[PDB]
Symmetry: C2
Subunit: 49 residues, 2 copies
């Protein structure tokens, strides 16, 4: 799975965690087997304006 | 004249200013006829690690 979120909302990508992303955007199962790999993408996704 | 500095040192690139960049690195004359251009390069010059 792949998506883009802000830095404060990275922690909501976790099993048994709440937030805007967990409730409304992306919910992990409470018993989840896998890896959450998040890296900063200022150079690729930001632009002036 | 092209160089890379910090964000907080951008205000030191001006005629008649003080600081580390103005005293030790790049000094602008008081009788300056010209333009100062400064753009953010977090995308291209910065690197994680």
């Amino acid at each position: 799975d792949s998506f883009v979120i802000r830095g404060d909302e990275v922690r909501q990508i976790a099993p048994g965690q709440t937030g805007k992303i967990a409730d409304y955007n992306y919910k992990l199962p409470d018993d989840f087997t896998g890896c959450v790999i998040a890296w900063n993408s200022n150079n690729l996704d930001s632009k002036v304006g």
